[PDB]
Ligand binder design. Structure first.
Ligand SMILES: COC[C@@H](O)[C@H](CC(C)C)NC(=O)[C@H](CC(C)C)NC(=O)OCc1ccccc1
Length: 212
């Protein structure tokens, strides 16, 4: 695998979304990977529906956090709709899936990256973006604003986000707090500190969609 990886220059990642009061992170996380895997496969980049997972995942908790591996499972059974087709309201409203017609895309599977292992997490990122979790409950993360983030932060992972790249001493992360946070909505969390947990918890749970 290469030294550097930045999915954005491969035309495989879309503009930074904001999630608002909703604990929709999981959806926003799972969607970045789907958008990426498909462009990687097909050749076209299209925004997908976070609101769709948020409303149709029976195993998550709507605006009260959820499990990106279940939402990612959701898009494996049925599929996902374009973003304009089923736009983001930011409140959980009933499952308007079928009532919208035929899904925009569907994936072959979901998967787990061996946890607490910064190496597996790099093999994977070098194929397509991946769902990753961390800790943002802290003032430092909330107040981040550029440069390589090192902390301080615990390992009490809450927030869900996506990894769209890496370099020698950082893992490029796409977060959903707008473009007026971090590096235009992005954050470069440092890697290679030996910590088996990863900075802020970055290696506690990682999943990605399979697409033949
Ligand atoms: C008041 O914060 C308490 C928290 O725990 C929760 C986090 C939860 C998602 C785990 N809230 C936040 O992090 C807030 C609010 C929004 C943007 C999510 N984020 C935030 O303030 O960062 C965005 C920001 C951007 C530019 C200037 C100042 C702040």
């Amino acid at each position: 695998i290469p030294e550097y990886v930045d999915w954005r220059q491969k035309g495989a990642v879309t503009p930074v979304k904001n999630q608002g009061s909703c604990g929709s992170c999981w959806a926003f996380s799972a969607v970045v990977t789907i958008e990426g895997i498909i462009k990687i496969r097909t050749g076209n980049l299209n925004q997908y529906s976070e609101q769709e997972l948020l409303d149709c995942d029976r195993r998550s908790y709507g605006c009260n956090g959820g499990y990106p591996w279940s939402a990612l499972q959701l898009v494996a059974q049925y599929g996902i709709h374009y973003r304009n087709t089923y736009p983001y309201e930011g409140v959980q409203r009933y499952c308007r899936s079928r009532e919208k017609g035929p899904y925009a895309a569907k994936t072959d599977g979901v998967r787990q990256v061996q946890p607490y292992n910064q190496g597996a997490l790099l093999y994977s990122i070098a194929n397509q973006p991946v769902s990753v979790v961390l800790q943002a409950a802290g003032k430092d993360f909330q107040l981040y604003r550029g440069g390589i983030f090192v902390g301080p932060c615990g390992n009490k992972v809450d927030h869900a986000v996506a990894a769209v790249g890496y370099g020698p001493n950082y893992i490029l992360i796409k977060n959903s707090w707008g473009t007026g946070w971090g590096e235009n909505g992005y954050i470069r969390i440092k890697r290679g500190t030996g910590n088996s947990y990863g900075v802020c918890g970055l290696y506690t749970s990682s999943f990605y969609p399979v697409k033949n």
